[PDB]
Design an enzyme around this catalytic site. Structure first.
Site, PDB file in Angstrom:
ATOM      1  N   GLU A  54     -11.511   6.327  13.422  1.00 52.30           N
ATOM      2  CA  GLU A  54     -10.189   5.674  13.204  1.00 52.30           C
ATOM      3  C   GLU A  54      -9.913   4.729  14.379  1.00 52.30           C
ATOM      4  O   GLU A  54      -9.414   3.617  14.150  1.00 52.30           O
ATOM      5  CB  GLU A  54      -9.096   6.721  13.064  1.00 52.30           C
ATOM      6  N   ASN A  66      -1.718  -3.332   8.352  1.00 50.67           N
ATOM      7  CA  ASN A  66      -2.168  -3.031   6.967  1.00 50.67           C
ATOM      8  C   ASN A  66      -1.712  -4.152   6.041  1.00 50.67           C
ATOM      9  O   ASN A  66      -0.739  -4.802   6.348  1.00 50.67           O
ATOM     10  CB  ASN A  66      -1.657  -1.651   6.563  1.00 50.67           C
ATOM     11  N   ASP A  75      -0.051  -3.998   3.350  1.00 48.75           N
ATOM     12  CA  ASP A  75       1.350  -3.758   2.879  1.00 48.75           C
ATOM     13  C   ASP A  75       2.390  -4.088   3.963  1.00 48.75           C
ATOM     14  O   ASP A  75       3.613  -3.949   3.694  1.00 48.75           O
ATOM     15  CB  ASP A  75       1.525  -2.330   2.340  1.00 48.75           C
ATOM     16  N   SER A 132       2.714  -2.429   6.812  1.00 51.29           N
ATOM     17  CA  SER A 132       2.754  -1.227   7.678  1.00 51.29           C
ATOM     18  C   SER A 132       1.692  -1.429   8.775  1.00 51.29           C
ATOM     19  O   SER A 132       0.893  -2.356   8.706  1.00 51.29           O
ATOM     20  CB  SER A 132       2.533   0.041   6.911  1.00 51.29           C
ATOM     21  N   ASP A 137      -0.965   0.980  11.466  1.00 53.22           N
ATOM     22  CA  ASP A 137      -1.569   2.261  11.936  1.00 53.22           C
ATOM     23  C   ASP A 137      -1.588   2.296  13.474  1.00 53.22           C
ATOM     24  O   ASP A 137      -1.955   1.277  14.114  1.00 53.22           O
ATOM     25  CB  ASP A 137      -2.981   2.429  11.393  1.00 53.22           C
ATOM     26  N   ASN A 152       0.260   5.927  10.168  1.00 55.39           N
ATOM     27  CA  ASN A 152       0.854   4.774   9.444  1.00 55.39           C
ATOM     28  C   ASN A 152       2.383   4.780   9.492  1.00 55.39           C
ATOM     29  O   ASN A 152       3.022   5.841   9.253  1.00 55.39           O
ATOM     30  CB  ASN A 152       0.368   4.775   8.000  1.00 55.39           C
ATOM     31  N   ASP A 189       0.331  17.982   4.180  1.00 55.05           N
ATOM     32  CA  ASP A 189       1.179  17.223   3.230  1.00 55.05           C
ATOM     33  C   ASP A 189       0.643  17.362   1.794  1.00 55.05           C
ATOM     34  O   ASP A 189       1.424  17.036   0.872  1.00 55.05           O
ATOM     35  CB  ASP A 189       1.276  15.744   3.627  1.00 55.05           C
TER      36      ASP A 189
HETATM   37 RH    RH Z   1       2.990  12.717   0.721  1.00 56.59          RH
END
Ligand code: RH
Ligand code: NA
Ligand code: RH
Ligand code: RH
Ligand code: RH
Ligand code: RH
Length: 129
Positions: free
Chosen positions: A35, A46, A48, A50, A52, A59, A101
């Protein structure tokens, strides 16, 4: 800070990531390698809009506030800047939320594409843990 391999394994272990949700320490070290190349300061914008952040590329769409990701959440209740610290505590606490999550470590695209199913124990070989 750019961590050494065994230096990061030791910090991650101290902060409770070895076997966290069943993921061995080698999984976390492998993820951090692909990463961020073990660099706490790493940032990547990113498509979109966003970004990281940090050693585990967390993110701004979901996990941290950077003030430039419209209609995003901050589920780790932290400024994204906290994730770039030489102290990995905030990254590790947020990574525990992320991996709990529902999709586990598949939340890390470098982990799924480059670590998952591989001999990840190799990433802690030769380390005093
Ligand atoms: Rh989620
Ligand atoms: Na956000
Ligand atoms: Rh800790
Ligand atoms: Rh602690
Ligand atoms: Rh390398
Ligand atoms: Rh030990």
């Amino acid at each position: 800070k750019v961590f050494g391999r065994c230096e990061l394994a030791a910090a991650m272990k101290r902060h409770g990531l070895d076997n966290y949700r069943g993921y061995s320490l080698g999984n976390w070290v492998c993820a951090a390698k692909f990463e961020s190349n073990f660099n706490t300061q790493a940032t990547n914008r990113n498509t979109d809009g966003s970004t990281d952040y940090g050693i585990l590329q967390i993110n701004s769409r979901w996990w941290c506030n950077d003030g430039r990701t419209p209609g995003s959440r901050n589920l780790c209740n932290i400024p994204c800047s906290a994730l770039l610290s030489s102290d990995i505590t905030a990254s590790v606490n947020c990574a525990k939320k992320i991996v709990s999550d529902g999709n586990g470590m598949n939340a890390w695209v470098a982990w799924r594409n480059r670590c998952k199913g591989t001999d990840v124990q190799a990433w802690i070989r030769g380390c005093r843990l």
